[PDB]
Design an enzyme around this catalytic site. Sequence first.
Site, mmCIF file in Angstrom:
data_model
loop_
_atom_site.group_PDB
_atom_site.id
_atom_site.type_symbol
_atom_site.label_atom_id
_atom_site.label_comp_id
_atom_site.label_asym_id
_atom_site.label_seq_id
_atom_site.Cartn_x
_atom_site.Cartn_y
_atom_site.Cartn_z
ATOM 1 C CB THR A 139 -0.966 0.029 1.218
ATOM 2 O OG1 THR A 139 -0.136 -0.049 2.403
ATOM 3 C CG2 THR A 139 -1.913 -1.148 1.161
ATOM 4 C CB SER A 257 19.205 -16.329 -25.096
ATOM 5 O OG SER A 257 20.412 -16.575 -24.394
ATOM 6 C CE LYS A 262 20.867 -3.890 -22.398
ATOM 7 N NZ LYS A 262 21.994 -2.917 -22.168
#
Lengths: 424, 424, 424, 424
Positions: A139, A257, A262
């Site tokens: 919250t 790959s 990132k």
Amino acid sequence: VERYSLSPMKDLWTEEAKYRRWLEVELAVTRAYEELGMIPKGVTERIRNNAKIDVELFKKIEEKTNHDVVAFVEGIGSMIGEDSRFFHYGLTSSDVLDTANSLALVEAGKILLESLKEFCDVLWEVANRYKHTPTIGRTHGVHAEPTSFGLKVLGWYSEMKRNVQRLERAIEEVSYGKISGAVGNYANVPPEVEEKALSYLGLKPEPVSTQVVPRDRHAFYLSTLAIVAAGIERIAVEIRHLQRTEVLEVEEPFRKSAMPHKKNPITCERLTGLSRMMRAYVDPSLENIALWHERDISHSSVERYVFPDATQTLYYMIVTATNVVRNMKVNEERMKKNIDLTKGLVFSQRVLLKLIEKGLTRKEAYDIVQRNALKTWNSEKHFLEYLLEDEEVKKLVTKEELEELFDISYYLKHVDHIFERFEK
Amino acid sequence: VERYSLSPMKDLWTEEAKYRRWLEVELAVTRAYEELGMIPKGVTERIRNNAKIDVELFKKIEEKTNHDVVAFVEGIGSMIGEDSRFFHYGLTSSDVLDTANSLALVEAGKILLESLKEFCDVLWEVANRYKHTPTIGRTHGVHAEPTSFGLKVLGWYSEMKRNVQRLERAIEEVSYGKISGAVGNYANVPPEVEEKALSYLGLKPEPVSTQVVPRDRHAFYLSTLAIVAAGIERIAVEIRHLQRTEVLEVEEPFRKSAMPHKKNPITCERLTGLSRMMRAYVDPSLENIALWHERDISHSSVERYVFPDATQTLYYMIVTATNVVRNMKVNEERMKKNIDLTKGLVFSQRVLLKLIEKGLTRKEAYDIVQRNALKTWNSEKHFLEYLLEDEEVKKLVTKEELEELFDISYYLKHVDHIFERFEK
Amino acid sequence: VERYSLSPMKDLWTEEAKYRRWLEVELAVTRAYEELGMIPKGVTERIRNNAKIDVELFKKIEEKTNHDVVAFVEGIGSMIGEDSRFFHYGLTSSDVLDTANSLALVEAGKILLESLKEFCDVLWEVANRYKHTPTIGRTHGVHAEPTSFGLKVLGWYSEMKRNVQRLERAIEEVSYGKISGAVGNYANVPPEVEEKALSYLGLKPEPVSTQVVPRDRHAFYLSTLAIVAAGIERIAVEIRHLQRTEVLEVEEPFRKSAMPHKKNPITCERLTGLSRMMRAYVDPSLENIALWHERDISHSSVERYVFPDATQTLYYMIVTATNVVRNMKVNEERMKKNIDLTKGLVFSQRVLLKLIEKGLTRKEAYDIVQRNALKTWNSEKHFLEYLLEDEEVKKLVTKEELEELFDISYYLKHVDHIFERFEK
Amino acid sequence: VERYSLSPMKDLWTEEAKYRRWLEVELAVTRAYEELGMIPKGVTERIRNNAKIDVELFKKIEEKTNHDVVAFVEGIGSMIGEDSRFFHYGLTSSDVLDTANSLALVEAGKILLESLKEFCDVLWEVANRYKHTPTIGRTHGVHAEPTSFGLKVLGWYSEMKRNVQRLERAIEEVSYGKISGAVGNYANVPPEVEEKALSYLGLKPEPVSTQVVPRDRHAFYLSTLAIVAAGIERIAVEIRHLQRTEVLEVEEPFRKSAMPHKKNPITCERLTGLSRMMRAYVDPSLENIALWHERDISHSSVERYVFPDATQTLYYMIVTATNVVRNMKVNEERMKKNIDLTKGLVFSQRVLLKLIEKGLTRKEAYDIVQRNALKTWNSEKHFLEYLLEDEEVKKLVTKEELEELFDISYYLKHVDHIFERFEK
């Protein structure tokens, strides 16, 4: 914007599709006149056989005319010989334009609805898959109390199920056409023809039209679309926060790959932007309601942007968000570990309350918890260990008693009952 | 803006009213805990007898606290002695704030709905009063074909009846509260207490809440309010056009002698402006949907403007528009005379068609009508008289035949059937 | 919303303040007539001596009148004896109303402008304080490359300095009044009186007015205010992210011991919500531009909300944001440590480029970097250490060469150049 | 919406045009590195010779890449041989994207500005043409006092001249680019390169950028455009009112015989609708300001609609409005005759004042004027004639004195003074 257009929906909004809808409306009206005995038997079947859509011809005539429906009526007139007497008979242009836009918004609405129900099916599957996966409720961006990740997804499910019911109501609101002539009072075309012609199209007659269908219906449909979009924005903002480098709880699907560090939530950032355009369309749709007298045409230029753009954008949003939630990676271990990022301080309210239950007053318990909380925050030792070594605590609670206050199970004990509310 | 606030509605949005709703919610929760056997018998009746609303005390505590519900709980705590142990038991502040705002939006919604049904009753009475009153239908601000003024008002009726159904749906959408604690999963307060407590208030439990009730419900309610306002704006713009000095068909009620030539439609201009503020509230309500995780409080400052201002503004709009339509002067003779402002040219399409029916082709009839139309427009002689003196016309149509094309009755022949659609 | 109202600004928008501005305009007009010899010497001083603001009297007359300016003129007339012949002479109500709102928006603008310059001063101080403090730049919420926290704050400074210039231009835009009578053509009050009277008030004459001052000026001013607000929202959203539990780089000021783990960025969430209201006022202000002919009064009801609410809200935002940035805690050590959260992977592009510089092709270097990045990501060992142990790396780069790629000083080398653009 | 697109403006927003701007930015950067001696002499010329825009190739690469700028860089790289080492060197994608959008918004701005100056020229010509043409000023849609039609048009001129200055300022605001690399701090491309490269493009460096140019500049530009549009809407709404059948004072240009009674102001209704779209783009543009940290890409999807659509729509509005005002018919005799629609009651305030000047008190004069006004209103006899026959009037004012109160020259006496404010 063509990069967000997707089949079935983008096929609805072509010029060929628009003229096919205008011919659909005109043939429903000739069929109704004929079924009522007002025009000679055989007319509808002969116009159906001779009337062809030729966009280039209509557009050429419109350069002379400057009026799109009139050019279409003249173009069709040139193919249908003497049956032109009974084509577009008594109609005003907006009887065809607005009834064809009701057809289009109804069809777009059904395409949207089917894709939204599929989205709900995906959200139900994912909420149940992670029903018992612990994660930290947050919250103000700050760790609050443990909860279940499935329950967070069920919240999205509940919202999209509200949006299914809302979109069914918006489809009903736009299911009204008009075949009422120049100022809506059937001077030139009978209300019996309107009722029959619109029933062949799956539409109802506007109970009172002017020259146009009243634009509060369209504003209701587009306000509904914007609320659906804003619910998708809510899910997209959540995934953006959860993919951030400090959180790493989810990862939206990507390329195929790649560099591990990132992975950016670009799809969800795009969905957030498209929600801004969906709510931008609400205001001009509301401003279109107050047309002058039995109409002005100010709404027509707005609707040339808004009808195709709002429906195609939301369709892209729903399909895209569906693939995101369906294929996102969910890092359960990282979610669980993140509950312990504050080293036990998520359970501080339970510790405070136990210290009051064992005699102390709010302010005394508060000061014990706060002192041990500050030591925890500023060091590597966990909260429980500070509490176990605190002499005032040691006099009030057994070690077993203290340790059970750190149970995640306390927070997840009512998850089933919440899911059971949806097995209706 | 106090000048637009009106009783019952303005009484809903005072600080005393807000604290009365927060105490209502808290006493429903203690009653539910007690009815379930979770807190001792007698607690609710003793808190009901001791807990009083003292705004000045709560506000004083809030200066220390800086948290409004916490100050109220502390203030009530100071009146209720040992029963404070069972008050606000397990709740988060937004369980009280959002459930009390659901109470308020439900109550405001019912006040609005009653006033809108009264408005519909007034529109039905006025549409039937002028059911057979002829007036000129206007498209693009230009005289088109005759119609009935009652039918124009029935169009307003039809819109306000759509808005009754929409406002009943928006009341249902906001009839959900939450008593689910800190992050919505009942860790600290049982779902059995929520269900019972909310049923005592006339509310349903949000099927899944977070720390807050999801804000797509509030955005749906306020989008609905803006669509009602825009329908009133449509009526107000019509009355403004009809009161203009060149038209003089209606006059909104006024002061209570006044100068005959200076009667301005100020009330309807005010209603048009207030519709702009009602639609201004939609965007920030839609932006409130995408709260972060289990909530952020950005929506609270928006809702402090929007909840009281949207509901009070629309209530003023409905009551005011009701008095306008109920008491406006309707100048029937002037409406009828205005049909003949173009000296018969409203019937030019009937004349054109008759000339084709009697043999001629579109372009020949067109040129006869256009020539006589230009003479009419540029002189004092009426269209019928030019046509009666035209030799080509004289060879094609009898004088009786020509004269019956100038009958207003042609345009009003289906008015009953349209009204009968509403005697459902 | 009284809760966001703050002196001086709230003092501008009382009823007393409004009538004091109406009186100021009237006295400027009597002064101008007197200086031109059109009314007798001494009138202005006598009216000044006698004309008292009595809000209760004006309101009581307005119950009879139903016209606010007329009631004020009658009320003042009852205090000034035979000088009432010279008071409000030739004026229309909007000469007073619109000139007084220009006074108000100019004065609110100057209050806003001084607070915004103070905010700039605070931002410059804080940006210089942390000018060289290292922090991780984040794109898409994902760690990108190191930068300085002072540069981040200087971006906010730069935006607020643009907003200083924009607010200066908006003040100039509203610095126009009108004393031109009923339809703006000086039939009843001379242009030399307007020019003199407005010069005493610090205002210029609208070069051509209708009954009112054209509302594109007010829309430009309010559009400007909303842009200032969105800049404050940008800052507030940044502080919310940086205060989250996983980041902990800043903490907004608070209460005044508190729990260390429960510090919520509530002020910045409130500022985000208030920016939504500021942008909500733009649409209705743009809709007010297209008034009918020489005016309708639809804008007056909108401006009763927007003028006081936009200016008071923004003043609260600026003052509040200034205190947030002035007194926020900045956790420099945590900022530095968060650069290493990904264990060196923030320098992966330098490593990739060096491998290409030492012969390899893009794809070969990519594969080496990606392999070592994945190992780093899924373990405890840092990227530099995997690279130091990689045999292909060991053949291409010395240890010193590798290690200097992990230097933060590469990223901060042009901070001083950027700060110099804003100096003296 | 292709239907509102017009050369030059539409040529700016094609895919070909976008990639030509991306290439221009890249070549400015290589030129700057070369002029600073950082890359070998001759590179820029060779890349210029070899780099061709091949939209189909870039799109095909982007299917693999999924990143538009990267695909462009790879596609150009395939044409330029070993010079690819120097191309896009140190840049981030938004250095190209945002600098190229600054180029685009500057060029669209200049196209807009030249069309708006032409519109001003037309407005000045038309205002002078009708400088002394009498017409009735209207407030609340009700006849108020005489004025000149040239003054009405000069008000539009004055507004469009304010919009010329505003558009000049908006162009300056977007005249900023960025060549500062990944997080805006020159770690990978030097500030001297940015300063030189942007100077070749006619742009200034953002004084501090993040990954992107700050979006308050674009929101200021688009807010400005929406204000220009609302000014055109004001003009269009005026022409719609004046073309209505009861008024007939102007007629917009049309087709190119037509029926005299069916001339509709369709172009001006279309312009009113397009202004609603222009203002709808402001909200999403303001929402794009609060990007996360050093950027998120939510703005990019919004700007794909708004940049091309806002600029093309406004250019269509300006060009179209210019032709409307240039070629509209102005019915001077009807304007003069409409002043007498109320049979002299437009001069009732002069009569009232004269009666008070000749002794009577406000209430006595009011009662005489009101009695004769009511008789006039409900009959065929003119106000002057009732006043000439009134015995109380006959005792107070000569016939010459009475008659000169009905002079239009009283109302037009300061027209020349207003036009002089805009002269040389």
